[PDB]
Amino acid sequence: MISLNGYGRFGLQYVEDRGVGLEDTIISSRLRINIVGTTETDQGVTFGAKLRMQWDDGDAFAGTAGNAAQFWTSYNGVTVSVGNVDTAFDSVALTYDSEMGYEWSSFGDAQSSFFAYNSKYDASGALDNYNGIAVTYSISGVNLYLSYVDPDQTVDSSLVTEEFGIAADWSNDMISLAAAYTTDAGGIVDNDIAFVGAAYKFNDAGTVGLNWYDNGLSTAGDQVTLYGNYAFGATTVRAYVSDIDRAGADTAYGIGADYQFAEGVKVSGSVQSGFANETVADVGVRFDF
Amino acid sequence: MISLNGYGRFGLQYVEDRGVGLEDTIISSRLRINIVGTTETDQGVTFGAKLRMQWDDGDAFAGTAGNAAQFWTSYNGVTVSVGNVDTAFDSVALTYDSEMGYEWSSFGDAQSSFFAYNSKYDASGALDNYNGIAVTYSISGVNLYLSYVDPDQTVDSSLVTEEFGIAADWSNDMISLAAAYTTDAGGIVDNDIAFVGAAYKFNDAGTVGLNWYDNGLSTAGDQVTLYGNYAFGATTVRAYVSDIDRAGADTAYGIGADYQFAEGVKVSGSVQSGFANETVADVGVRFDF
Amino acid sequence: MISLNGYGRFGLQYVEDRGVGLEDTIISSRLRINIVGTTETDQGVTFGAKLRMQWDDGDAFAGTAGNAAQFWTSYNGVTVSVGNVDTAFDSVALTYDSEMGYEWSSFGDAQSSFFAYNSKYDASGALDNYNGIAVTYSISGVNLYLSYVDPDQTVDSSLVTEEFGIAADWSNDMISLAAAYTTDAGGIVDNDIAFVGAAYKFNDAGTVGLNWYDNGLSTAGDQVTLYGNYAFGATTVRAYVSDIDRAGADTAYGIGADYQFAEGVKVSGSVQSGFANETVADVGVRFDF
Ligand SMILES: CCCCCCCCOCCOCCOCCOCCO
Ligand SMILES: CCCCCCCCOCCOCCOCCOCCO
Ligand SMILES: CCCCCCCCOCCOCCOCCOCCO
Ligand SMILES: CCCCCCCCOCCOCCOCCOCCO
Ligand SMILES: CCCCCCCCOCCOCCOCCOCCO
Ligand SMILES: CCCCCCCCOCCOCCOCCOCCO
Ligand SMILES: CCCCCCCCOCCOCCOCCOCCO
Ligand SMILES: CCCCCCCCOCCOCCOCCOCCO
Ligand SMILES: CCCCCCCCOCCOCCOCCOCCO
Ligand SMILES: [Mg+2]
Ligand SMILES: [Mg+2]
Ligand SMILES: [Mg+2]
């Protein structure tokens, strides 16, 4: 069986004083199509393969292509994936929950470098022999994630830096906890990064959380992000504040809102301020199909 | 929801004395696939996104890729589209009705340069930040079209030439009228082009029309195309004559026929003569799927 | 109508002493998606078009694209195809039946150069004007194949070498015979190649066959491959031995097995030895979707 799914989004993206001779406000948009092939068996083992075709405004050649494939095998809550895999630091819960606006962005996201699923081709040639293995285990309320990425699998193993990641999250109706650790993140020797977060659903309607990171070799140093969101019917209001250890950095913050226009159609906007005083804003729509 | 549609065509394409050491007759063919994602809402607003994958004989690398995305929102007869849009001069009725043969070609089509939906990627890099907005309004028998294209939306607005177009058409059972005007067509300063056309369905079976153009900065100058077609059961016969103002040009003309082999399968052929005496012919099949 | 089908495969591929500083064992995988558009008519003539998107580990840019299109028309057992066609030497029965392992490989396959369907784009530009015509006729038990490939159809016909192929196979419940001949195979003047094979289903469970080739200008010279396979319930065991005329070559051989895990899911592995003493092994899974 083959299924197709995806989303389109478009809106306005503003970056205060973007550059000499550049418009500060542009129309930013994205089309994402996922192609998933799955083979179910009566033994209960499912096999799957996925390809993505994603276009973003500004993409070279005004064209769209597929990325590198991902393959998986699932059985009894356990999933093993190979190729262009989802990594542990990128898949744990809570770590991206301060994002807002129609492009799901936040200065409060981790300021470190690490491997993650590659949505597109890479013209530099750097990903040509990139290969990962990931294992996930979902055991009710608990999620475990393990990932191993070799950026160049054809070359002798001791000549390249491989990334090893581990993560777990846990939740009930009111509290959630999550932690992750990755050594040689992004294939950079000694770039060891870590995350610990927690969130409290202080209602049926609100949530408040705190994420802490060790950003490894990044110049940002350690980081803390405090965020919250509250739903009033179809409208959701979001906010965050984030601090990094880099000398002289400003406190980053953001405020945004979402409006659920219909099932699968969401209008979102945000106004945010960065660690170097950058001001960014956006307003747009995303529709899922 | 995601749907796929398209067409394949193949046949013989003859160009008298095509070039030293070249075959005059080749097998010309095209595969077009459209991928359309749509999200309908109970409020009556539809959201859509489309991508095209088109291959033509001769394409570089013997490969096929997607083009840049188009997004739209429709409500009550009004459609707003963004990104790789259909433009007013290219979407009005009548302007391409002298086309014939299995590749829908005619020297009687406008001999001007203007933006239109881009079916493929562009390796020159020229379309990378190209972005348009279009608005169409279909109000029974009447169609209005407006389009605005900025060929490089990231650069300051006064540093690039944007194309603005407007058009309308109108029809009843027997007469049709259409007009279009576009300033700085193709992003070329002062290339202002215009079209006015009319057609008469002088039966249930025949139609005769006349299109007039102002080709802006093109060397062709003003142009007039007179065409007609007549259906005899499954067979359609077509003809046209066209004249341009360029000094010394020949009168262009063409004669062709279509045969409706089955629903979605059409066999077509034509013999045509250009403004510089070029002789071209074709015969082939198109099938829609 | 548009349908999608394909397969994913992944596993381990070992090549003894692959190269200085290279891993001998890698994770080799492939994702293949076929997109087929078909138009059926009440006259009984079917029209079709197909595109393939295939990714293999190691592919340049870590991306996937479509290949060049193939078009066909079928009526009463006869199929005419144009564009990126299947060729006679590549489509006859028996010629690849010694293959084994999850990548369907065998040193006992013909060691000659010839055109075949191109699964991917070609960055060299060599296939840009490549165009073939093929005709197949399936007349109960009998299959005839004819193919003509012009590697550069736009250039004068006497300036390029075209490949012409013919083949036939025939089978009943127990015996199968097949033969093929291709002149100027691969567009190489005087590279004339030929195949003759036969197989005997010495049970409901086993088969033994012998293929002979004339490899044209290849340095391998003539070749003979003897192979067999036997099914024990869900498990199939395969073997082959092959000899070429090249001076000093070793006898190539291979032994493998397949396990039918479920409909559409097959686990396969093989250990093989080449004409230059290369040792190769593989174990993996293929799943069809
Ligand atoms: C096989 C899938 C198609 C992907 C191949 C595209 C290869 C194009 O690059 C060739 C080398 O030139 C470098 C291109 O510039 C960077 C492009 O991508 C960045 C997205 O905006
Ligand atoms: C023309 C350039 C500016 C384009 C940016 C659009 C920015 C618009 O969005 C502003 C951010 O929206 C957040 C509002 O704060 C929440 C208000 O109170 C909650 C109920 O709506
Ligand atoms: C008319 C000249 C072009 C100047 C361009 C400015 C046009 C602004 O956008 C108009 C339509 O397209 C884009 C944005 O989508 C709107 C955002 O979110 C939805 C409703 O709150
Ligand atoms: C991202 C979609 C893939 C499109 C990228 C292809 C880029 C190839 O070009 C790289 C630069 O070299 C120039 C190519 O020659 C022109 C090709 O297109 C013309 C169609 O026949
Ligand atoms: C071998 C090179 C020539 C390939 C070109 C094929 C050209 C064939 O088509 C000729 C054009 O067909 C138009 C006929 O005029 C209409 C006739 O009367 C109407 C009822 O059929
Ligand atoms: C046999 C040597 C190759 C010489 C090539 C000429 C072959 C001509 O075309 C044969 C089949 O393929 C293409 C054309 O489709 C026919 C056109 O329209 C349909 C019926 O009127
Ligand atoms: C139009 C479909 C996209 C295919 C175009 C890709 C073109 C990229 O090449 C541009 C020129 O540079 C040469 C690339 O190196 C070889 C790539 O393919 C081999 C597969 O591993
Ligand atoms: C770690 C590198 C080695 C990876 C190669 C895996 C090779 C494994 O497969 C060995 C080949 O399998 C063939 C067995 O011979 C058939 C046995 O008897 C029949 C019933 O199973
Ligand atoms: C753990 C460090 C990484 C070392 C890589 C070796 C891992 C070997 O493969 C594990 C999973 O992925 C690949 C192979 O599929 C297995 C083959 O066939 C199926 C069962 O017989
Ligand atoms: Mg953008
Ligand atoms: Mg063509
Ligand atoms: Mg491989």
- In DSSP notation, C233-248 reads TTEEEEEEEEEE-STT
Taking alpha carbons only, the member of C95, C87, C109 closest to residue C198 is C95
Dist CA A149 CA A130 (whole Å): 7
Residues of A in contact with B2 (CB under 8 A): 4-6, 33, 289
Mind telling me how many Å the CA of A7 is from chain C's nearest CA?
20
Taking alpha carbons only, the member of A242, A234, A227, A237 closest to residue A266 is A234
Q: Extract the runs of DSSP E, i.e. beta strands, from B57-192.
A: 70-75, 78-83, 131-138, 142-150, 163-171, 175-183
Residue from B2, B4, B5, B31 to probe the interface with C (highest C Cβ count within 10 Å): B31
Q: Say how many C-beta atoms besides its own lie within 10 A of residue A274's C-beta.
A: 17
The angle at the Cα of A93, spanning A120 to A11, to the nearest 5 degrees, equals 50
Enter the tokens of residue A23.
Answer: 């418009």
Identify the three-state secondary structure at position A259: strand
Count of CB pairs separated by less than 8 Å, B with C: 125
Site of tokens 């090893």: A164
Ligand 9 proximity of C11 Cβ (cutoff 6 Å):
yes
CB A13 within 8 A of CB A25: yes
Q: What are phi and psi of C281, to 5 degrees?
A: -145, 160
Dist CA A164 CA A145 (whole Å): 11
Within 6 A (CB) of ligand 1 lie A 59-60, 65, 121, 123; C 61, 63-65
DSSP string, B12-63: EEEETT-STTB-SEEEEEEEEEEEEEEEE-TTS-EEEEEEEEEEETT-GGG-
Sequence-distant (≥ 6) Cβ neighbours of residue B226 within 8 angstroms: B108, B208, B209, B210, B240, B241, B242
**Ligand 7 atom 16, closest CA:** C123
Cβ–Cβ gap C262/A43 under 8 Å: yes
Residue type, C24: D
Dist CA A188 CA A161 (whole Å): 7
Burial bucket for residue C52 (CB in 10 Å: 0-12, 13-18, 19+): buried
Q: Which helix (H) or strand (E) holds C90?
A: helix C88-91
- In which region does residue B251 sit, left (phi positive, over 0), alpha (psi from -120 to 50) or beta (all else)? beta
Ligand 8 proximity of C14 Cβ (cutoff 6 Å):
yes
Ligand 8 proximity of C257 Cβ (cutoff 6 Å):
yes
The angle at the Cα of A233, spanning A230 to A238, to the nearest 5 degrees, equals 25
Residue type, B56: D
Enter the tokens of residue C258.
Answer: 């397949």
* Facing residue for C65 by CB, picked from A65, A73, A129: A65
Q: Say how many C-beta atoms besides its own lie within 10 A of residue C151's C-beta.
A: 19
Dist CA A122 CA A133 (whole Å): 20
How far away, in angstroms, is A82 Cα from ligand 9 center? 9
Ligand 8 proximity of C285 Cβ (cutoff 6 Å):
no
Q: Say how many C-beta atoms besides its own lie within 10 A of residue B226's C-beta.
A: 17
Report helix, strand and coil shares of chain A as percent, to nearest 5: 5, 55, 40
Q: Could you give the dihedral angle defined by the CA atoms of residues B58, B62, B68 and B72, in that order, rounded to the nearest 10 degrees?
A: 80
How far away, in angstroms, is A269 Cα from ligand 2 center? 5
Dist CA B131 CA A60 (whole Å): 14
How far away, in angstroms, is B11 Cα from ligand 6 center? 7
Mind telling me how many Å the CA of C8 is from chain A's nearest CA?
6
Taking alpha carbons only, the member of A128, A152, A130, A156 closest to residue C19 is A156
Q: What are phi and psi of A186, to 5 degrees?
A: 75, 10
Residues of B in contact with A2 (CB under 8 A): none
Site of tokens 């195949």: C195
Report helix, strand and coil shares of chain B as percent, to nearest 5: 5, 55, 40
Dist CA A136 CA A79 (whole Å): 5
Q: Say how many C-beta atoms besides its own lie within 10 A of residue A173's C-beta.
A: 7
Q: Say how many C-beta atoms besides its own lie within 10 A of residue C172's C-beta.
A: 9
DSSP single-letter state for residue B85 = P
Return the partners of chain B (3 or more C-beta pairs < 8 Å): A, C
Dist CA A40 CA A42 (whole Å): 7
Domain harbouring B236, CATH code = 2.40.160.10
Number of folded domains that form chain B: 1
Q: What are phi and psi of C256, to 5 degrees?
A: -150, 180
Dist CA C256 CA C229 (whole Å): 9
Burial bucket for residue A58 (CB in 10 Å: 0-12, 13-18, 19+): middle
Relative to the alpha carbon of A148, which ligand is closest? Answer: 9
Q: Which residues surround ligand 10, an ion (CB under 5 A)?
A: A 28, 57
Q: What are phi and psi of B60, to 5 degrees?
A: -60, 145
* Facing residue for C68 by CB, picked from B6, B55, B262: B55
Q: Please give the C-alpha separations between residue C17 and each of A37, A128, A156, C278, in angstroms, as whole numbers.
A: 35, 22, 12, 9
Residue type, A9: R
Q: Say how many C-beta atoms besides its own lie within 10 A of residue C64's C-beta.
A: 26
Dist CA C170 CA B175 (whole Å): 63
| Euclidean distance between the first and the last CA atom of chain B, given in angstroms as a whole number | 18
Cβ–Cβ gap B33/C43 under 8 Å: no
How far away, in angstroms, is A3 Cα from ligand 4 center? 29
> What is the widest separation between alpha-carbon atoms in chain C?
62
Taking alpha carbons only, the member of A257, A251, A259 closest to residue A278 is A251
Dist CA C259 CA C285 (whole Å): 9
Dist CA C55 CA C64 (whole Å): 6
| Euclidean distance between the first and the last CA atom of chain C, given in angstroms as a whole number | 18
| Residue A213 structural domain | 1-289
Dist CA A83 CA C55 (whole Å): 11
Mind telling me how many Å the CA of B267 is from chain C's nearest CA?
12
Dist CA B182 CA B116 (whole Å): 12
CB C144 within 8 A of CB C247: no
Q: Which residues surround ligand 12, an ion (CB under 5 A)?
A: C 28, 57
Cβ–Cβ gap A33/B35 under 8 Å: yes
Dist CA A195 CA A97 (whole Å): 13
Ligand 5 proximity of B271 Cβ (cutoff 6 Å):
yes
Q: Which helix (H) or strand (E) holds A90?
A: helix A88-91
Within 6 A (CB) of ligand 3 lie A 10-12, 27, 267, 283-285; B 82, 133, 148
Residues of B in contact with C115 (CB under 8 A): none
The angle at the Cα of A74, spanning A68 to A80, to the nearest 5 degrees, equals 55
Residues of A in contact with C22 (CB under 8 A): 154-156
Within 6 A (CB) of ligand 6 lie B 10-12, 27, 267, 283-285; C 82, 133, 148
Residue from A39, A53, A117 to probe the interface with C (highest C Cβ count within 10 Å): A39
CB B211 within 8 A of CB B232: no
Site of tokens 């597109």: A120
From C121, C124, C127, the mutation candidate for ligand 7 (largest count of ligand atoms within 8 A of CB) is C121
Enter the tokens of residue B71.
Answer: 């997004």
Dist CA B257 CA B234 (whole Å): 10
**Ligand 4 atom 14, closest CA:** B123
Residue A34: alpha-carbon gap to chain centroid: 16
CB B27 within 8 A of CB B11: yes
Q: What are phi and psi of B157, to 5 degrees?
A: -50, -35
CB B236 within 8 A of CB B230: yes
Cβ–Cβ gap C159/B4 under 8 Å: no
Chain A's closest residue to B37, CA to CA, is A289
Taking alpha carbons only, the member of C49, C35, C40 closest to residue C5 is C35
Mind telling me how many Å the CA of B68 is from chain C's nearest CA?
15
Chain A's closest residue to C264, CA to CA, is A39
Cβ–Cβ gap A82/C22 under 8 Å: no
Q: What are phi and psi of B40, to 5 degrees?
A: -95, 150
Residues of A in contact with C60 (CB under 8 A): 125, 128
What resolution in angstroms does the PDB record give?
Answer: 1.9
Burial bucket for residue A66 (CB in 10 Å: 0-12, 13-18, 19+): buried
Taking alpha carbons only, the member of B142, B205, B225, B214 closest to residue B185 is B214
Enter the tokens of residue B236.
Answer: 């359609």
Return the partners of chain C (3 or more C-beta pairs < 8 Å): A, B
| Euclidean distance between the first and the last CA atom of chain A, given in angstroms as a whole number | 18
